[PDB]
Design a protein around this ligand. Sequence first.
Ligand SMILES: [Cl-]
Ligand SMILES: [Cl-]
Ligand SMILES: [Cl-]
Ligand SMILES: [Cl-]
Ligand SMILES: [Cl-]
Ligand SMILES: [Cl-]
Ligand SMILES: [Cl-]
Ligand SMILES: [Cl-]
Ligand SMILES: [Cl-]
Ligand SMILES: [Cl-]
Ligand SMILES: [Cl-]
Ligand SMILES: [Cl-]
Ligand SMILES: [Cl-]
Ligand SMILES: [Cl-]
Ligand code: NA
Length: 129
Amino acid sequence: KVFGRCELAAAMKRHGLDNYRGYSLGNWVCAAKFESNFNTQATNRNTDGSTDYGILQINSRWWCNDGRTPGSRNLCNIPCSALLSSDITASVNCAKKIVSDGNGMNAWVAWRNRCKGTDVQAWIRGCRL
Ligand SMILES: [Cl-]
Ligand SMILES: [Cl-]
Ligand SMILES: [Cl-]
Ligand SMILES: [Cl-]
Ligand SMILES: [Cl-]
Ligand SMILES: [Cl-]
Ligand SMILES: [Cl-]
Ligand SMILES: [Cl-]
Ligand SMILES: [Cl-]
Ligand SMILES: [Cl-]
Ligand SMILES: [Cl-]
Ligand SMILES: [Cl-]
Ligand SMILES: [Cl-]
Ligand SMILES: [Cl-]
Ligand code: NA
């Protein structure tokens, strides 16, 4: 599914991401924009052989099982395929675990490089929330 901006903002808020670990909704929307362009089916292969999956490009090195990442973990206890669903529940639940791991949203390199410190409220401006 490719979400609309405000559509995704509303979904993330309904799943409790808004201000989760202190990160306002626009941080999450911004991250999803640059990770996936709001496409739940986004995948991308890393240099190390892991793969990032879904709206928030969650990686198989730690977070999910794809059967093809040697030595990896599955700390969200999900198949990585769950992260590609039109239903964002699994991506959100797993993102809550990631952002709690100690480095906050810096776990998303793209967040650090493109969202951190910017006017992230722009990403939710206008939306009925
Ligand atoms: Cl929308
Ligand atoms: Cl947009
Ligand atoms: Cl918020
Ligand atoms: Cl915001
Ligand atoms: Cl990489
Ligand atoms: Cl597993
Ligand atoms: Cl497997
Ligand atoms: Cl594996
Ligand atoms: Cl393969
Ligand atoms: Cl594990
Ligand atoms: Cl599995
Ligand atoms: Cl959803
Ligand atoms: Cl889940
Ligand atoms: Cl933090
Ligand atoms: Na894994």
